[PDB]
CSV table of C-alpha atoms in Angstrom, one decimal:
chain,number,residue,atom,x,y,z
C,474,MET,CA,-79.1,-11.3,-151.1
C,475,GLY,CA,-81.1,-9.3,-153.8
C,476,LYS,CA,-78.4,-10.7,-157.2
C,477,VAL,CA,-80.1,-12.2,-160.2
C,478,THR,CA,-77.8,-15.1,-162.0
C,479,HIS,CA,-77.4,-15.3,-166.0
C,480,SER,CA,-75.2,-16.6,-168.7
C,481,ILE,CA,-72.9,-14.7,-171.0
C,482,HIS,CA,-71.4,-16.2,-174.1
C,483,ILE,CA,-68.9,-13.8,-176.1
C,484,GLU,CA,-67.0,-14.7,-179.2
C,485,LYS,CA,-64.0,-12.5,-180.6
C,486,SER,CA,-63.7,-12.8,-184.2
C,487,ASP,CA,-60.5,-14.8,-186.0
C,488,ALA,CA,-56.9,-9.9,-182.3
C,489,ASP,CA,-58.5,-8.1,-179.5
C,490,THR,CA,-59.5,-8.7,-176.4
C,491,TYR,CA,-62.8,-9.5,-174.2
C,492,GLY,CA,-62.3,-6.0,-172.7
C,493,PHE,CA,-62.7,-7.0,-168.8
C,494,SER,CA,-60.7,-7.6,-165.9
C,495,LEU,CA,-61.3,-9.9,-162.6
C,496,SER,CA,-60.2,-9.6,-159.2
C,497,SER,CA,-60.2,-12.3,-156.5
C,498,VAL,CA,-60.3,-13.0,-152.8
C,499,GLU,CA,-60.8,-15.9,-150.1
C,500,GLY,CA,-66.5,-20.1,-151.4
C,501,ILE,CA,-62.5,-20.6,-150.8
C,502,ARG,CA,-61.6,-18.4,-154.2
C,503,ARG,CA,-64.1,-16.4,-155.5
C,504,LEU,CA,-64.1,-14.0,-158.6
C,505,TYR,CA,-65.7,-10.4,-159.1
C,506,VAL,CA,-65.6,-8.3,-162.6
C,507,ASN,CA,-62.9,-5.4,-162.0
C,508,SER,CA,-63.5,-3.5,-164.7
C,509,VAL,CA,-65.3,-3.5,-167.9
C,510,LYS,CA,-64.1,-1.4,-171.0
C,511,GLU,CA,-66.5,0.8,-172.0
C,512,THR,CA,-66.2,0.2,-175.6
C,513,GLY,CA,-65.1,-3.6,-175.4
C,514,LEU,CA,-66.8,-6.9,-176.0
C,515,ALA,CA,-67.7,-7.9,-172.6
C,516,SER,CA,-69.3,-4.2,-171.7
C,517,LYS,CA,-71.4,-4.7,-175.1
C,518,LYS,CA,-72.6,-8.4,-174.1
C,519,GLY,CA,-74.0,-7.3,-170.4
C,520,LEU,CA,-71.2,-7.8,-167.8
C,521,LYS,CA,-71.0,-4.8,-165.3
C,522,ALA,CA,-68.3,-3.9,-163.0
C,523,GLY,CA,-69.1,-5.6,-159.7
C,524,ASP,CA,-70.7,-8.5,-160.8
C,525,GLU,CA,-69.4,-11.7,-159.1
C,526,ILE,CA,-68.1,-15.0,-161.4
C,527,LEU,CA,-69.7,-17.8,-160.7
C,528,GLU,CA,-68.5,-19.9,-163.7
C,529,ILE,CA,-66.4,-20.0,-166.4
C,530,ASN,CA,-66.9,-22.6,-169.2
C,531,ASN,CA,-69.5,-24.5,-166.6
C,532,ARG,CA,-66.6,-24.6,-164.0
C,533,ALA,CA,-66.8,-23.4,-160.6
C,534,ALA,CA,-65.0,-20.1,-159.7
C,535,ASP,CA,-63.5,-22.0,-156.8
C,536,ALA,CA,-61.7,-24.8,-159.5
C,537,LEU,CA,-60.4,-22.7,-161.8
C,538,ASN,CA,-56.5,-21.7,-161.2
C,539,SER,CA,-54.2,-19.0,-162.7
C,540,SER,CA,-53.2,-20.9,-165.9
C,541,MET,CA,-57.2,-21.9,-166.8
C,542,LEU,CA,-58.3,-18.3,-166.3
C,543,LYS,CA,-55.5,-17.2,-168.5
C,544,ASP,CA,-55.7,-19.8,-171.2
C,545,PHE,CA,-60.0,-19.3,-171.1
C,546,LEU,CA,-60.2,-15.9,-171.3
C,547,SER,CA,-57.3,-15.9,-174.3
C,548,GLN,CA,-59.8,-18.1,-176.1
C,549,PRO,CA,-61.8,-17.4,-179.4
C,550,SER,CA,-65.2,-18.2,-176.9
C,551,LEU,CA,-66.5,-17.2,-174.0
C,552,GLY,CA,-68.3,-18.6,-171.7
C,553,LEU,CA,-69.6,-17.0,-168.2
C,554,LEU,CA,-72.2,-17.5,-165.3
C,555,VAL,CA,-72.7,-14.1,-163.3
C,556,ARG,CA,-74.5,-12.8,-160.6
C,557,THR,CA,-75.3,-9.0,-160.7
C,558,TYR,CA,-77.6,-6.4,-159.4
C,559,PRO,CA,-80.1,-5.7,-161.5
C,560,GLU,CA,-80.1,-1.8,-162.3
V,211,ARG,CA,-55.6,-11.3,-154.9
V,212,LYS,CA,-54.7,-11.4,-158.3
V,213,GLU,CA,-56.3,-9.4,-161.2
V,214,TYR,CA,-56.8,-11.0,-164.7
V,215,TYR,CA,-57.4,-9.0,-168.0
V,216,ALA,CA,-59.4,-11.0,-170.7
R,1235,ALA,CA,-49.4,-30.8,-159.9
R,1236,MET,CA,-51.1,-31.6,-163.2
R,1237,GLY,CA,-52.1,-28.9,-165.8
R,1238,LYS,CA,-53.4,-30.2,-169.1
R,1239,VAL,CA,-54.0,-33.8,-169.9
R,1240,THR,CA,-54.8,-35.1,-173.5
R,1241,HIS,CA,-57.2,-37.9,-174.1
R,1242,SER,CA,-58.8,-39.3,-176.7
R,1243,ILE,CA,-62.8,-39.6,-177.1
R,1244,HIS,CA,-65.1,-41.1,-179.5
R,1245,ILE,CA,-68.6,-40.7,-180.0
R,1246,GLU,CA,-71.2,-42.4,-181.9
R,1247,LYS,CA,-74.6,-41.3,-183.0
R,1248,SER,CA,-77.3,-43.1,-185.2
R,1249,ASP,CA,-78.9,-40.8,-187.5
R,1250,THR,CA,-76.5,-38.0,-190.1
R,1251,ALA,CA,-78.1,-34.9,-188.6
R,1252,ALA,CA,-75.4,-31.9,-188.8
R,1253,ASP,CA,-76.1,-30.9,-185.1
R,1254,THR,CA,-76.4,-33.9,-183.3
R,1255,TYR,CA,-73.3,-34.8,-181.6
R,1256,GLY,CA,-74.5,-31.6,-179.1
R,1257,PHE,CA,-71.3,-28.9,-179.4
R,1258,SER,CA,-69.8,-26.3,-181.0
R,1259,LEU,CA,-66.3,-25.6,-182.2
R,1260,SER,CA,-65.1,-22.1,-182.2
R,1261,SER,CA,-61.5,-21.2,-183.9
R,1262,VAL,CA,-58.7,-19.0,-184.1
R,1263,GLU,CA,-55.5,-19.0,-186.1
R,1264,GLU,CA,-51.9,-17.4,-184.8
R,1265,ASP,CA,-48.9,-17.6,-186.5
R,1266,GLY,CA,-50.2,-19.6,-189.8
R,1267,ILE,CA,-51.7,-22.6,-187.5
R,1268,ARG,CA,-55.4,-22.8,-186.3
R,1269,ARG,CA,-56.5,-24.2,-183.0
R,1270,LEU,CA,-60.0,-25.7,-182.3
R,1271,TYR,CA,-61.4,-24.9,-179.5
R,1272,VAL,CA,-65.2,-26.2,-178.0
R,1273,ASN,CA,-66.9,-23.6,-177.7
R,1274,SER,CA,-70.0,-24.7,-176.3
R,1275,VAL,CA,-71.3,-28.3,-174.7
R,1276,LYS,CA,-75.0,-29.5,-174.6
R,1277,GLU,CA,-75.2,-30.6,-170.7
R,1278,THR,CA,-77.5,-33.8,-172.0
R,1279,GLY,CA,-75.7,-34.1,-175.4
R,1280,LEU,CA,-73.7,-37.3,-176.9
R,1281,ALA,CA,-70.6,-34.9,-176.4
R,1282,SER,CA,-71.2,-34.4,-172.6
R,1283,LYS,CA,-71.7,-38.3,-171.7
R,1284,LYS,CA,-68.3,-38.7,-173.3
R,1285,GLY,CA,-66.7,-36.0,-171.3
R,1286,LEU,CA,-65.9,-32.9,-173.9
R,1287,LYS,CA,-66.0,-30.0,-172.2
R,1288,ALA,CA,-66.5,-26.3,-173.2
R,1289,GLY,CA,-62.7,-24.8,-173.2
R,1290,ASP,CA,-61.2,-27.9,-174.1
R,1291,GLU,CA,-58.9,-28.0,-177.0
R,1292,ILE,CA,-59.5,-30.1,-180.5
R,1293,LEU,CA,-56.2,-31.4,-181.1
R,1294,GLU,CA,-57.5,-33.6,-183.9
R,1295,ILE,CA,-61.0,-35.0,-185.7
R,1296,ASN,CA,-60.3,-38.6,-186.9
R,1297,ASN,CA,-56.8,-38.5,-186.8
R,1298,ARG,CA,-56.2,-35.2,-188.2
R,1299,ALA,CA,-54.9,-32.3,-186.6
R,1300,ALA,CA,-56.9,-29.6,-185.9
R,1301,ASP,CA,-54.7,-27.2,-188.6
R,1302,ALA,CA,-55.3,-29.5,-191.3
R,1303,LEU,CA,-59.4,-29.3,-191.2
R,1304,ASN,CA,-61.3,-27.0,-193.6
R,1305,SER,CA,-65.1,-26.3,-193.3
R,1306,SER,CA,-66.2,-29.0,-195.1
R,1307,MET,CA,-64.6,-31.7,-193.6
R,1308,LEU,CA,-65.7,-30.3,-190.5
R,1309,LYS,CA,-69.5,-30.8,-191.6
R,1310,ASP,CA,-68.9,-34.2,-192.7
R,1311,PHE,CA,-67.4,-35.5,-190.1
R,1312,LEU,CA,-69.8,-34.1,-187.8
R,1313,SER,CA,-72.3,-35.1,-189.6
R,1314,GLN,CA,-71.0,-39.1,-189.4
R,1315,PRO,CA,-72.3,-42.0,-187.3
R,1316,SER,CA,-68.7,-42.2,-185.6
R,1317,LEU,CA,-66.4,-39.4,-184.6
R,1318,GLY,CA,-63.2,-39.6,-183.2
R,1319,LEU,CA,-61.6,-36.8,-181.0
R,1320,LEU,CA,-58.4,-36.0,-179.1
R,1321,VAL,CA,-58.7,-33.6,-177.0
R,1322,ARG,CA,-56.7,-31.8,-174.2
R,1323,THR,CA,-58.5,-30.6,-171.5
R,1324,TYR,CA,-58.1,-29.7,-167.8
R,1325,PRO,CA,-59.2,-32.2,-165.1
R,1326,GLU,CA,-62.3,-31.7,-163.1
R,1327,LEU,CA,-63.0,-33.8,-160.0
N,1226,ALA,CA,-59.7,-25.7,-204.5
N,1227,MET,CA,-60.2,-29.6,-204.4
N,1228,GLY,CA,-63.3,-31.4,-202.0
N,1229,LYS,CA,-63.9,-35.0,-201.9
N,1230,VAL,CA,-62.1,-37.9,-203.9
N,1231,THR,CA,-63.0,-41.0,-204.8
N,1232,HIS,CA,-60.6,-43.8,-205.3
N,1233,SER,CA,-60.3,-48.0,-205.6
N,1234,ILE,CA,-58.3,-50.2,-202.8
N,1235,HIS,CA,-58.1,-53.3,-202.7
N,1236,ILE,CA,-56.4,-55.8,-199.7
N,1237,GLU,CA,-55.4,-58.9,-199.9
N,1238,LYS,CA,-54.5,-60.8,-196.5
N,1239,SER,CA,-51.8,-62.9,-197.8
N,1240,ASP,CA,-49.5,-60.1,-198.3
N,1241,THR,CA,-48.8,-60.6,-194.4
N,1242,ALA,CA,-50.8,-63.6,-193.4
N,1243,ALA,CA,-53.1,-61.3,-191.8
N,1244,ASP,CA,-56.0,-62.7,-190.0
N,1245,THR,CA,-57.5,-59.3,-189.9
N,1246,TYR,CA,-58.0,-55.9,-192.4
N,1247,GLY,CA,-57.5,-53.7,-189.2
N,1248,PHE,CA,-60.6,-51.4,-189.6
N,1249,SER,CA,-63.7,-51.3,-188.7
N,1250,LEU,CA,-67.0,-49.5,-190.6
N,1251,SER,CA,-70.2,-47.6,-189.0
N,1252,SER,CA,-73.6,-48.8,-191.1
N,1253,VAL,CA,-76.4,-46.1,-190.4
N,1254,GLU,CA,-79.9,-47.4,-192.3
N,1255,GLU,CA,-81.6,-44.1,-192.7
N,1256,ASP,CA,-85.0,-44.0,-194.2
N,1257,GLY,CA,-83.9,-47.2,-195.0
N,1258,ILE,CA,-81.7,-46.4,-197.0
N,1259,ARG,CA,-77.8,-47.2,-196.2
N,1260,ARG,CA,-74.6,-45.5,-195.9
N,1261,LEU,CA,-70.7,-46.9,-194.9
N,1262,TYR,CA,-68.2,-44.9,-193.1
N,1263,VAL,CA,-64.9,-45.5,-191.5
N,1264,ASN,CA,-65.3,-45.8,-187.9
N,1265,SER,CA,-61.5,-46.5,-186.8
N,1266,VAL,CA,-58.2,-47.9,-188.6
N,1267,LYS,CA,-55.0,-49.4,-187.3
N,1268,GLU,CA,-52.1,-47.2,-188.3
N,1269,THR,CA,-50.2,-50.5,-188.9
N,1270,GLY,CA,-52.5,-52.8,-190.8
N,1271,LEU,CA,-53.1,-53.7,-194.2
N,1272,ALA,CA,-56.1,-51.2,-194.5
N,1273,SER,CA,-53.9,-48.3,-193.3
N,1274,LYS,CA,-50.8,-49.9,-195.8
N,1275,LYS,CA,-53.6,-49.1,-198.8
N,1276,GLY,CA,-54.7,-45.3,-197.8
N,1277,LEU,CA,-57.8,-45.9,-195.6
N,1278,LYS,CA,-58.6,-43.1,-193.4
N,1279,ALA,CA,-61.0,-42.5,-190.2
N,1280,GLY,CA,-64.0,-40.9,-191.8
N,1281,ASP,CA,-63.9,-42.6,-195.1
N,1282,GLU,CA,-67.0,-43.1,-196.8
N,1283,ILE,CA,-67.3,-46.5,-198.5
N,1284,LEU,CA,-69.1,-46.2,-201.4
N,1285,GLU,CA,-68.5,-49.7,-202.7
N,1286,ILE,CA,-67.5,-52.9,-201.8
N,1287,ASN,CA,-66.4,-55.7,-203.8
N,1288,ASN,CA,-68.6,-53.7,-207.0
N,1289,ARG,CA,-71.5,-53.4,-204.7
N,1290,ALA,CA,-73.1,-49.9,-203.6
N,1291,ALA,CA,-73.8,-50.0,-200.0
N,1292,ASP,CA,-76.9,-49.5,-200.1
N,1293,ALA,CA,-77.6,-52.8,-202.1
N,1294,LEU,CA,-75.4,-54.6,-199.5
N,1295,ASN,CA,-77.1,-56.1,-195.8
N,1296,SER,CA,-75.3,-57.6,-193.0
N,1297,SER,CA,-75.2,-61.1,-194.0
N,1298,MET,CA,-73.1,-59.7,-197.3
N,1299,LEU,CA,-71.0,-57.2,-194.9
N,1300,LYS,CA,-69.7,-59.8,-192.8
N,1301,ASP,CA,-69.3,-62.4,-195.5
N,1302,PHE,CA,-67.4,-59.7,-198.0
N,1303,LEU,CA,-65.2,-58.0,-194.3
N,1304,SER,CA,-64.0,-61.6,-193.6
N,1305,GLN,CA,-62.9,-63.4,-197.0
N,1306,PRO,CA,-59.1,-63.1,-198.0
N,1307,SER,CA,-59.4,-60.3,-199.9
N,1308,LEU,CA,-61.6,-57.2,-200.4
N,1309,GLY,CA,-62.3,-54.4,-202.6
N,1310,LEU,CA,-63.9,-51.5,-201.8
N,1311,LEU,CA,-64.6,-47.8,-203.8
N,1312,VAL,CA,-64.0,-45.1,-201.2
N,1313,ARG,CA,-65.0,-41.6,-200.9
N,1314,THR,CA,-62.2,-39.4,-199.0
N,1315,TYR,CA,-60.8,-35.9,-198.4
N,1316,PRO,CA,-57.1,-35.1,-199.4
N,1317,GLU,CA,-54.9,-34.7,-196.2
N,1318,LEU,CA,-54.3,-30.8,-195.9
T,791,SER,CA,-80.5,-48.4,-187.4
T,792,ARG,CA,-76.8,-48.3,-186.6
T,793,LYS,CA,-74.4,-51.4,-186.7
T,794,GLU,CA,-70.4,-51.4,-185.9
T,795,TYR,CA,-68.8,-54.1,-188.3
T,796,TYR,CA,-64.9,-55.2,-187.5
T,797,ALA,CA,-62.5,-56.4,-190.6
């Protein structure tokens, strides 16, 4: 409903985090960007609070479990497909 | 609902 | 309930170009052990057609452990007409 | 810091009365020039016992350069009772 | 041009 979909790719050097958090809800499972650390990697790459996460590493949100999420979010690179409102 | 930190 | 699974992937190409397998790797060292992960997979590329996925872990390349590979060997192996990988992945429908 | 190394391998099927050496080779003819790479190696086979590894490059067979070999020669030599190889490999890390 | 050989 008036949103735009786009891809984000982030890499971490060699040991900080991506600087964001995600929230879940029950098309069954849906992932939203909960917070974005003002001075974090995700923020710099254009991730915004309230964005919906459609895919991580090419896998749909509803197909991701906690183990996969934890693994993917801790890897040295991360791909996201996100739906966001233009500013 | 659960929060995950990256 | 299945978590990760490990499986072998073998890929072949007809040239000696460095980037023709259609994937890239990212690296992280923890506790003195280097781990390799699939950074990106080209949608129509060779690796994708063999079932390599973004976020997969590469355990071995050509029977050598990930922590026993250096950057020179990586470039070489990734440019050869054939490539063998031992991969850890999450099942996908 | 040591890169690749070259070494000579000689294999005789008479060692264990084997019918095969237990490896495969990929041959790329690019620009008309030819290179030979080791595609796979059987762990319990004669080649493995003499140090051949997946990803090795074969520079010579029976004292002939890879670019000087053709399909006929390759099939002939690889099926003989004994075989000499000049191999370029990376040391195990 | 690519061929596989088993030995």
